[PDB]
Structure formats: C-alpha cells, structure tokens
Amino acid sequence: AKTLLHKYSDIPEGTECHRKAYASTSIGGATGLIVSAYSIALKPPASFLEGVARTGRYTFTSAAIGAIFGLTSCISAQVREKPDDPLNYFIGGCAGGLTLGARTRSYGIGAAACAYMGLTAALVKMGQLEGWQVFAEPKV
Amino acid sequence: MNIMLTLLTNVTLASLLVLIAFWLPQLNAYSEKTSPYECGFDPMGSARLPFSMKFFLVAITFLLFDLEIALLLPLPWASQTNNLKTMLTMALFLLILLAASLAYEWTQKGLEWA
Amino acid sequence: MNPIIYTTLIMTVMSGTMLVMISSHWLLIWIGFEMNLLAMIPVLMKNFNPRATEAATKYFLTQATASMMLMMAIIINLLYSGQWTITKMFNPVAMTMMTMALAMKLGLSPFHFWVPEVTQGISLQAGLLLLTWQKLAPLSVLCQISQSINPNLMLTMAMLSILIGGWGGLNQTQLRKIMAYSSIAHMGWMTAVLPYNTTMTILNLLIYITMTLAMFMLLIHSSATTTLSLSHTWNKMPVITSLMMVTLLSMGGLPPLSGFMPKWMIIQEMTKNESIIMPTLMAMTALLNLYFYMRLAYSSSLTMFPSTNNMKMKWQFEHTKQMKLLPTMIVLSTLVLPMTPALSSLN
Amino acid sequence: TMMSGRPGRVPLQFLPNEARSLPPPKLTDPRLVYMGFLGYCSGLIDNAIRRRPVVSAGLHRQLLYVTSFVFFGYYLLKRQDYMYALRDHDMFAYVKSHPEDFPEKDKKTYGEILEEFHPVR
Amino acid sequence: PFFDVQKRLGLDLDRWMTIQSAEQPHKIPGRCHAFEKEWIECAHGIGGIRAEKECKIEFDDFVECLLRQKTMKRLSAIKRQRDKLIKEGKYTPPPHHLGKEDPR
Amino acid sequence: YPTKETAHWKPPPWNDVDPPKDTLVSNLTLNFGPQHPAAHGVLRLVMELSG
Amino acid sequence: MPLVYMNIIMAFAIALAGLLMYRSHLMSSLLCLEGMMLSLFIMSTLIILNTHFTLANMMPIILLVFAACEAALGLSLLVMVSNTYGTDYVQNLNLLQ
Amino acid sequence: LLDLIWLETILPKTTSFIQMKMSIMVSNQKGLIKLYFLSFLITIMISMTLFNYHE
Amino acid sequence: LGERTTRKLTETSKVITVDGNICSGKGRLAREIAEKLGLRHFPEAGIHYADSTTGDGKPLDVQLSGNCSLEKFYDDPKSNDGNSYRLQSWLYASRLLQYADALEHLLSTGQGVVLERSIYSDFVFLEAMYRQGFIRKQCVEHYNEVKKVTACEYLPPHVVVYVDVPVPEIQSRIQKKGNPHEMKITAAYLQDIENAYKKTFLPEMSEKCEVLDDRTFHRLRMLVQNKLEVLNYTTIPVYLPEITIGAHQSDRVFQKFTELPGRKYSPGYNEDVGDKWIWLK
Numbered sequence A: 001a002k003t004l005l006h007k008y009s010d011i012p013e014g015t016e017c018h019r020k021a022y023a024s025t026s027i028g029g030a031t032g033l034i035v036s037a038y039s040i041a042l043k044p045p046a047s048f049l050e051g052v053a054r055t056g057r058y059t060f061t062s063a064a065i066g067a068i069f070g071l072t073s074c075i076s077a078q079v080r081e082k083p084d085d086p087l088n089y090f091i092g093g094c095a096g097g098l099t100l101g102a103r104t105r106s107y108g109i110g111a112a113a114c115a116y117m118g119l120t121a122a123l124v125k126m127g128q129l130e131g132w133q134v135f136a137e138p139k140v
Numbered sequence B: 001m002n003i004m005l006t007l008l009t010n011v012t013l014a015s016l017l018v019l020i021a022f023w024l025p026q027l028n029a030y031s032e033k034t035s036p037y038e039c040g041f042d043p044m045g046s047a048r049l050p051f052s053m054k055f056f057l058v059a060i061t062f063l064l065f066d067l068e069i070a071l072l073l074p075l076p077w078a079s080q081t082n083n084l085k086t087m088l089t090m091a092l093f094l095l096i097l098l099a100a101s102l103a104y105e106w107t108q109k110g111l112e113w114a
Numbered sequence C: 001m002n003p004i005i006y007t008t009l010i011m012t013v014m015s016g017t018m019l020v021m022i023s024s025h026w027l028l029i030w031i032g033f034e035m036n037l038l039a040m041i042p043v044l045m046k047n048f049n050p051r052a053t054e055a056a057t058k059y060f061l062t063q064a065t066a067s068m069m070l071m072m073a074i075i076i077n078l079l080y081s082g083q084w085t086i087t088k089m090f091n092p093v094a095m096t097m098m099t100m101a102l103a104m105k106l107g108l109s110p111f112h113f114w115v116p117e118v119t120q121g122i123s124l125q126a127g128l129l130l131l132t133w134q135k136l137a138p139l140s141v142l143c144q145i146s147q148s149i150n151p152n153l154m155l156t157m158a159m160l161s162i163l164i165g166g167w168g169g170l171n172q173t174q175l176r177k178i179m180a181y182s183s184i185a186h187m188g189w190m191t192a193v194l195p196y197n198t199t200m201t202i203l204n205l206l207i208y209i210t211m212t213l214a215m216f217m218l219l220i221h222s223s224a225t226t227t228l229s230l231s232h233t234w235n236k237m238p239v240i241t242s243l244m245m246v247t248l249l250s251m252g253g254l255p256p257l258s259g260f261m262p263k264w265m266i267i268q269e270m271t272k273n274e275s276i277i278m279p280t281l282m283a284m285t286a287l288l289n290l291y292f293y294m295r296l297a298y299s300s301s302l303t304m305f306p307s308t309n310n311m312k313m314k315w316q317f318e319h320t321k322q323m324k325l326l327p328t329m330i331v332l333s334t335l336v337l338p339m340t341p342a343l344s345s346l347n
Numbered sequence D: 001t002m003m004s005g006r007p008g009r010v011p012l013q014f015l016p017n018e019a020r021s022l023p024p025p026k027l028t029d030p031r032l033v034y035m036g037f038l039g040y041c042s043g044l045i046d047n048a049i050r051r052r053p054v055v056s057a058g059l060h061r062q063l064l065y066v067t068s069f070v071f072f073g074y075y076l077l078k079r080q081d082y083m084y085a086l087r088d089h090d091m092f093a094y095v096k097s098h099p100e101d102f103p104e105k106d107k108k109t110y111g112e113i114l115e116e117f118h119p120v121r
Numbered sequence E: 001p002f003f004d005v006q007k008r009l010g011l012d013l014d015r016w017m018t019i020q021s022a023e024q025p026h027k028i029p030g031r032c033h034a035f036e037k038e039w040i041e042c043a044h045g046i047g048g049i050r051a052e053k054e055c056k057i058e059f060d061d062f063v064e065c066l067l068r069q070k071t072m073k074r075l076s077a078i079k080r081q082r083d084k085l086i087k088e089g090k091y092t093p094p095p096h097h098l099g100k101e102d103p104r
Numbered sequence F: 001y002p003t004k005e006t007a008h009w010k011p012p013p014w015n016d017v018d019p020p021k022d023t024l025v026s027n028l029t030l031n032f033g034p035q036h037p038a039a040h041g042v043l044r045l046v047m048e049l050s051g
Numbered sequence G: 001m002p003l004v005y006m007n008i009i010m011a012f013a014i015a016l017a018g019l020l021m022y023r024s025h026l027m028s029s030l031l032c033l034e035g036m037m038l039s040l041f042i043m044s045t046l047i048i049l050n051t052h053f054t055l056a057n058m059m060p061i062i063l064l065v066f067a068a069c070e071a072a073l074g075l076s077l078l079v080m081v082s083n084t085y086g087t088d089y090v091q092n093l094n095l096l097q
Numbered sequence H: 001l002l003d004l005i006w007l008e009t010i011l012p013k014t015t016s017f018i019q020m021k022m023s024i025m026v027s028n029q030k031g032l033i034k035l036y037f038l039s040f041l042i043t044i045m046i047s048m049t050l051f052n053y054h055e
Numbered sequence I: 001l002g003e004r005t006t007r008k009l010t011e012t013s014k015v016i017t018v019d020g021n022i023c024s025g026k027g028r029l030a031r032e033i034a035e036k037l038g039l040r041h042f043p044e045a046g047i048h049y050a051d052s053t054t055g056d057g058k059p060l061d062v063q064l065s066g067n068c069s070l071e072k073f074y075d076d077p078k079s080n081d082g083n084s085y086r087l088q089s090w091l092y093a094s095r096l097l098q099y100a101d102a103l104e105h106l107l108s109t110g111q112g113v114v115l116e117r118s119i120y121s122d123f124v125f126l127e128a129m130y131r132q133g134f135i136r137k138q139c140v141e142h143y144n145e146v147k148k149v150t151a152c153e154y155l156p157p158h159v160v161v162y163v164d165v166p167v168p169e170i171q172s173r174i175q176k177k178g179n180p181h182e183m184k185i186t187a188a189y190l191q192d193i194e195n196a197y198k199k200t201f202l203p204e205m206s207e208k209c210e211v212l213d214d215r216t217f218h219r220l221r222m223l224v225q226n227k228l229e230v231l232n233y234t235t236i237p238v239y240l241p242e243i244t245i246g247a248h249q250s251d252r253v254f255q256k257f258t259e260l261p262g263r264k265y266s267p268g269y270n271e272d273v274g275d276k277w278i279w280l281k
C-alpha cells in the first residue's frame, strides 16, 4: 500500500537507523512476494514444496537487499552527516548489489548490480530533492 | 410463510418415503447382484462418449429460442400500453426474426435434428 | 461460408463498433462490445484449422471474461451514483475495474498474452482486421472516460505495454507474431497519453491503423509469413520488399517518416505536464521496438537470402486480385510528416 | 478534451457556418500543392506495384489520384484554419475574462535590473 | 470519439432510458426523484468540472437518498445504544398494544 | 535465440497441422438381447453404434 | 450499503476466482462464467427493485439475454475442441504466452 | 583490452546480452492457458489493492 | 465474389488423365487418350509447359525456364549436381499447374477435358529414383512435405484411366524409339517404377475413383484461378543444396528474365511486343 512507502518516507533525515531499516526491509519483502508470485504463476514449479522453496528464495533475497540498503544509507547519513546529498544513498545503492551479488554467488551479476542499483538509488534521492513527478497529474 | 412451508412439507415427505424405502426391506445386498444391468451379458465398458454434432446443432437453437421467448413474456402486459402503434411493430418484429432465424436454419440444412 | 453471409457478419461487426461510438447510455456500450464479440469469433474460423480453433478459443475466453468484469464495474458504478450516462465514474474501486476490463480489450500488458498467440492462429486478412478494427471500440470508450482515469494505473500499463511490446518482439521469426508485438507496443503509446490529451491519442491511432494496413496489405500481396518465406520475395516482385523496408522504418519512427509524427506530438503533450522522465524512458525503449523491424528488414530487402529454384516458373505469373486501397495506405503512412498541423482538425 | 463540448456548436457537421467568414485558402497554397504531389506519388506507386510501365501508363488514373487528394486536402485546410483561429479567439476572450490572472507586468529595463555575471575561464 | 449522431439527428433513441426521472410509464416517481431533479437543474453550463465543486452538496443529499448510508449508521447507533439501557430502561408499552391499531 | 529445451520443439507447419487428426478414435459398441424384448429372447445383435 | 449486497458481490469475486484458477477440461470455465453472469444479474435486479427506477426493470432481462447468448456460443467452440481431443485445457497448440 | 574488449563490453555487449535474457524470458515459447490466465488473476488482486487509494 | 449474382454453376462433368506408364509407350498412351476425349489432350506439360501459357506461348531456353534438361538426366544420372532431383520436383510443379490449367476449364465451360498424366502419377518416378539412389533421401522428405502441403487441398481426383504395359516390351519399343537418351535408360529402375506404381498408385487411387457440395466447388474454383496460389507453397524454403540457389545466380538469371520482350510488364501493358499504346494514352 502507499501508506507503507509513506511510512518509509518519514525517515526523518536518517535518524534512528533501525526504524528506517525495518521499513526498507518491509518494502524489499513486498517486492519479493510479488516477484515470487508472478514467477510461480508463469513458471509452474511442479511439486509445491519446491514452489515455497522458490518464494522463500526471492522473498528473503529482496528483503535482505532492502535491509542492507536502508541501514547503510542511514548510517552513512549519520556518519558523514552531510547528510542530504544524493551520494548519501549511492553507497547503499552500491552496497545493495553486493548483497544481490552474494546470493547469486557471482562476481559478475554482483558487479553490475552494484553500479546500476547505485545509480538508480542516487536518482531517487535526487528526485526527492527535486520533486520530479514521474507520474505527473494531467494539469496541462 | 406460505410457499416455503409447502416446499418443506413436500421435500420432507419425499425424503421420508426414501428413508422408509431403504431402511425397511432389510435383506442381503451382494456383488454381481449389484453389478450394472446390461441385458444379461456384462458390459463391454463403462459409459463414455456418445458424441454427436446433431445434439448441439439443434439444442443450441433451443437455447437461442428460449432466450427469445424470454422476451416474448412481457407481451401481455405491454399490450395495455397507451401507444400500441409504437409497440405493435416490435410485437411482430421479434416474432419475424424468430421465424427468420428458424427459416435460416430450415434450409442451410442445419436442422437435421435426430 | 458464402460471401453473402460473410459480409453480413463483417458489417455487423462494423455496426457492433459503431454502436459503441454512438450510444451514450452504458448499457448500449456493453451491448456494443457484446454484439461485437459474437460477430468477431466466426470470422476467425473461416478456412478452419485444428490450430485456428484453439486460436478462437483463446480470443473468446479472454474477451468474455473482460466483458464480464466490465459489466460488473458498471453495475457498481450505478450502485454508487444511480446513473447510466458515461461521464465521470463515482467510485474508484469500480473505476479501476473498468480500466482493467478495457485493458484486456486493448490487449495491454500484463493482460497481453493472448494477442501474440491469437494472431498466430489466423490468416492475415482476419489478422489485420483483428489488429485494427478491434482496437477502435475500447479506445472509443476510453476517450469518453478520460476525464476520470486514475493516471497512475494508466501509465503503468501504458509503459509496461511498451517494454513487453519490446522484449517479446526481438525473439520471433514468423511475421504474424511480430506484428502482434508491434501493435501491442503501439497501444502503449496510445494509452499513455490518454489521461493527458485525447486528441493526440486519436492522431496516433490513425497513424497506427494506416501503418498496419500498409503491412498487412503487403504481406497479403506476397503471401509471406515465416521470415524466410519473406526472404525469397526480393527476386519475385522486388518492389514490394523494397517497400516493406520503408513501411517498416515508418513503424520505427525514423524522423523524416510519418510514424515519427505520433511520438513527437506525444512527447510534446506529456512535456507540458512536466512528467519529463516518463517520455524519456518511453522514447528510449521505442528504439528497442525498432530493432526487430530492422532485423526483419535485413531478412528481406536490404539483403538477398538464397532463392529456391522452383521460384523460376512463378516469375511468369503476375499477381492478381489487386487491392485498390493499398497504395494510398502506403503513402499516407509515410510522406505525410509536413502535415502534422492538420492534426488540429481533430480538435 | 477542449474545444469539443464547447458551448453552442453542433456535433457532426464538418464545418460551422461560424467559419465561412475566415478567408478560404488560396488556390496555390503550398501545403495544398503538396497534397497534390502526395496524391501524385501515390498514383505512381499504384503503377509500380502492379508492374505496369510506370509513369506513362494509366496517366488517366494518376490524374484521378492527384485531383482526389488535392480536393480533400482543400477542405481539410479550411477546417485547419478554422480550428486554429478558433482557439486564438477563445484564448483572447478568456484573457479579457480574467485580467487579474494575466497581470500587465511592469517592464523594468536592463539598467534598472541587476543580474549576476559569469566570467568565462 | 463520442459521436453524438443521435443528438444531431435528434433521434433520442437512447437518451430516454437514462436518468432516474425523464418520463417513465404511468408517471411512476423514482424513489429519489427530487434530489436528482435539483441536482440536475444545478447542472448545465457549469459543465462537468466546476460541477463537481459547486453542486457537491446536492449530489451528497442525492447519495444519501440512494444508499441511506448515514441514516443507517445513526439508526444502528441508536439500536445498539438501546441494549445498554435494556436493563436500565423498559422502553415503550404501546408498541405492544397502543393506539397504533386504533390510529387508522 | 532458441533455448535447447525449446530447440527440441519442431518448427510450425506451413499450413493445417494435420497430424493430430490421426488421434481421434471415438467409438461405441453395445448389445441388444437376449432379454431385450425386441431381441425375441434369443438374439445378441452386438453393434458399434455412433451417437 | 446493506450487507446483502456485499454478499452477492463476494459471490461475484468467487465466481471470478473460480474462472481464473482454471483447471483441466475447460467446460468448468463456461460454468464459472455463467455463474458470474448470474451474480451480476441478481446484483442488478436488486438495485432496480430498490430505487423504483422503473425503466431499468427492462435491463436485467436484456442483460441476461446477451450474456446467456455468448455462453450459448461458447459451447460451440468447446465442441470443436472436444471434437479433436475429448476436451482438456491441458492441450494447447499455440506458442508464446 | 581497453577499446576492443572493454569499451565494447561496457555498453553494446551489456544491453545486447540483457535483451537476450529478457527476450527469452518474456517470450517463453510455451503458452499454456492456466499459466498466464492465473497471472491475470493475481495481477487483478494487486491492481485493486495497490491503487485502492483509500487507507 | 461475383458468385453472389448467380450462386455458382449447377453443371458437372469430368476430365480424363490416362495413366500410361512407359517410354515409347508413354507416347502411345497419349495418342489413345487424345482420340478418346473431346477435351484438348495434355501435351505432357514439361519444361516449357508454363511458357506455352505465359503469353508468347513459346518455349524459352532451358537455362531459366527449368534449368534441368531431361537429356542431361539420362546421359548422366547421379550427376553430382542434383539434377536427378532438380528435374523431378520441377516437373511436379509444372504438372500441378497442368491440373490448374484444365480443372479450372472444367469448372468454367463445364466441358470435359483430357489431361495426359497428372499429379498423382508423379509419386512414382521419384519413388524409383530414390531406389536407384539417383536422389538423396532429404530430397524425398522435401518432396513429400511439399506434396502434403500442396496436394491435400486439391480434393477431387480421378475420372481417369490407369493402364499397363510390360517392362520388357516397353524396352523393346524403346529400342525402336529414335532418341538415344531413351535407349540408354536402365531397366531395373523402370521395373522398380512399374512395381511400386502398380503396388500403390492404383491400389489407393482406384478406391477414390470408384465413387466417380456446390459452395465448396466455388471456393475451389477461386483456387483454380490466380495460379501462383496453387504454386504458393511450391517454393517452400527448406534449403536442400540441389534445389536452392545462391543469391548471385538468382539475381542474375532473373535479371536476365526481364530481358525478354514480354516479361518486363504485365502482359496487357507491354510496349516491346506490340500491345496497344492507346491504353497508356
């Protein structure tokens, strides 16, 4: 629900890293359940225990990514104490890929995931700073 | 109420007849006696697929007439409307199409029934 | 099936859409789609194949469930406002479902999976008609309910239709499935701008229909299907392959060509709304859409796949049964670019 | 939707009597002649697709095409100018309708205003 | 493209079925004819957009006319209140045998 | 870009995909008497009736 | 809105989820669809009975018609698919979802 | 390695590979109904809640 | 599509394709058949059979009209060039067209018309060539897929007479026959022909001929016209090395085909051959 992202949105700044990290963990878990849902839907696992194995995989992975992203971001905020510039998320962004790199046990995918996930996060922060509309209202 | 009461008494009556039908003769069921009837000799196989296009080819036409008569039903009440000339064409109209539909089937040899 | 009946079916399809474009009352719209369906299925069943049958099974099954959800959401709208006129809907839980039902009717992703398959199951005649005429009515109602659309929900399918309309397009050989992913991709561009400004939608619609008329008339003219089957045509009647190249590029929207006119008005409109990021992603992916038009161009005109010998006798025999409407459908779908401003005729 | 649903006016008529007053496009408006060549080339492809000895053959039908598209192109141009003239009219009427929201801002000159200078280095 | 040919030709073939009022056989009233009538009379040249602002109150009363939503939440609140008083209060004797049968 | 798992699958037929037609094998077979009143007490006219 | 309406709507939601869980021979789906149809019918008619919005007394029956009509069509397609197999959804010729 | 093997790896070969994966993934050849049809189901279940707007 | 004005013809008849199976006896079969039927006799419809109907009505060079040459079959059968097959399939396409040339005429004038050998008879030459090994097996697989894809839609066959001649006797007439290439032809091949021919061709086809709807006929009538359609699947891409041609040779040869007076343009328009210029106005 939007109320959940709204929950994560009230960081504030980066204070209480745990409070934030729990929320990011929540979002990562949500997306993990969705991806698991379509995956099961479109790739009939055969033998249902394997299916819950699959969903356990994705759910735990995405939840992990969200957790580590959130807490590295807030910690960087509470350490560099810059704390508002976009790069402050980027480390976590770069960190996130490595998490993804760990479960996949591959340097390659982890390496790429570092860079792109990093840039995406950086753009997100930059967007919060700039009020980018992504889905702008018809206005015109 | 009224009607629900008679429904209940009827169904309970029948169910009563069933129960006095089974739990009464009190004798010996056994295998082969309970085997399905097949005019003496045993069946060559359990009932499967008596397929026929000639079933649906007409039965569907049943369904699409029954939908039509469903529209015919309002007619007795519609007859008392204030403006029949506005109505009357339609009262005829559907019937024509009903007939027309049949007519179309009549001669595309789609009505082989049986 | 003799032409006298075939024409009555196709005309009652035309009527079954015109009815949607006329009536203001909702019930007549749902009747419009409903009559449209019954008259759409049989025309897919001409010639009749073991394959075609399950094609029609797919199409019917999805269109039926779509129409069902639609009628349900109408009834809920009535429950919470007691109206039948189109206008605004008055209950978001209903409105999202009317959006879903229409989302199936356009074949937008992730509801899209039926369209590439169904196209495979029918001849290019019934195919073309399915990819053009069927795209009118649901859009014909979306333009009427643009006023209250929940833009988030619309842009998400509008984008995802473009990504899926891309990635599923790089993969296939036989052309019909590719035409399916082309259309499934353009619908993303139509339904994208719809919340913001309907006139751009209708413009893009006209270009799309003209385009796919160009292609399907050409595929008919050469009776090509699988890509390789298309490959031989360069030697027999070189012109038409030498023209598939161009119409393909107009699908691709290389800017002198007409097919650029849609995107380049769309980018305008959305940009007035700010929303600057979305068109950038969209326009970038449209490239990915272009690429398989290009590869398909490589199989055909730009390069000569080896001919089979048996072709030679076929050289003596001119094609027949000319399709009158074609040349204009090429030309309008290409050269018309310095006639954008005329779009305002659509007000 | 704008323009559509505007008060007054009637639906399907292609072109209001309220137009007419606008000057007609002149006979050799370049856009229009471009409709000409558009039809021309279509008429030519009509030959090339069906083999034919291109250009010289069927000069007849070719003339039919060019007359066709120039003809429709004409009225389409009329509706074009009508529509744009229309939005210009509605716009100005609306700017008189709400003078407050379209302020007549005072125009300070360059001498009057400061602006930061950025040396090129 | 909401072609409105039925309007230009004046056929009205569809329009009649629309709306709670709009002439019905034997002039049978809609259950919520009044709020609807007011609300539509409010709605003309205002057209659609400003209409969802200014005519909101009328549409609201029309809503409660349709669903009786609020009067039900109230009436429910009363009937649920009465249980609390059920031991503290004996309610009304007549309901049981009052002049309501004499009343006609 | 086929996967090998997909590569095992055959290319589509150039027309009707006729082969599956071989598959339909529907039939029924059934017997009259002896009991059956029309069987005159002593006939076993087994027959492979259609619909 | 009174609880009864909520109950019928829920019967719709089940009449859909049943269509989409979608399993084995498809004849079940034409059933589930018709059930869906019936729920929409009833949910409409209760409303038209509610507000005495009399003209709309005509709709539910008309609704019913076309809806029944398409279902009447649907069986025919099943016939054809039944004609070559003895029906099951499990067998589909077409490729690429 | 600097310009024939990385500088080409970093953005032609990347995208060109990612589309290999995605394209074989989306167009999964199969087409069994129960699959994506059930997918229509869950996508409806998501579509309703995520955009429900109300709390 | 004009059938709506008349609802198709009610007339019926039959075309007759005698199936004489020999060398010199093949000619003998044709002579008996020509005298036998009022309808014009099949002339064999070989390499230039298309050229006969093309417009000039006249045979071209072998190089492009067929690029097979039968004499170059008999003189070196099992040529490394797959001519041993290239002729087979090319002839099959031509004979298919034969059907179309005449069966349409059956649906038109309603008169009977006499074919010479017809498509069902083309099963056998390949049936033997595969046995003598003149053609590789894939050539055959290509031949029966294209067979199944093309023949199946042609529905009615027959109204035609099978025949027989002794292998040795045909060998005798073959000796009498003037052409050197015919004389060279091997015996064991021809015996394998007659053996499989009698074993299967008549064995199946007679069951259909023994039986010898209007709307279907009209649909079939549409197929008879616009012959490329009947040819539409004969150019299926399967890319066997003997049939297939590299782009250079094809681009060149077709570049040569246009060089002919009657081929640049559709026949009614062409200026090179004296078609009226008045239409070009």
Ligand SMILES: CCCCCCCCCCCCCCCCC[C@@H](O)O[C@H](CO[C@H](O)CCCCCCCCCCCCCCC)COP(=O)(O)OCC[N+](C)(C)C
Binding pocket: C129, C132, C133, C143, C202, C209, C336, C339, C340, C342, C343, C345, C346, C347, D004, D010, D011, D012, D013, D014, D076, E001, E002, E003, E004
């Ligand atoms: C079997 C194969 C499938 C075939 C499928 C293709 C069918 C194509 C149908 C295309 C629809 C076009 C509409 C034309 C109908 C004429 C009626 C016309 O008079 O309508 C009037 C309005 O006039 C029309 O706008 C005239 C449109 C003329 C079409 C071309 C306009 C310019 C084209 C711009 C692109 C550049 C190309 C130009 C090159 C010539 C009244 O409508 P109005 O009540 O007012 O508003 C309706 C609401 N709208 C605007 C949202 C639709």
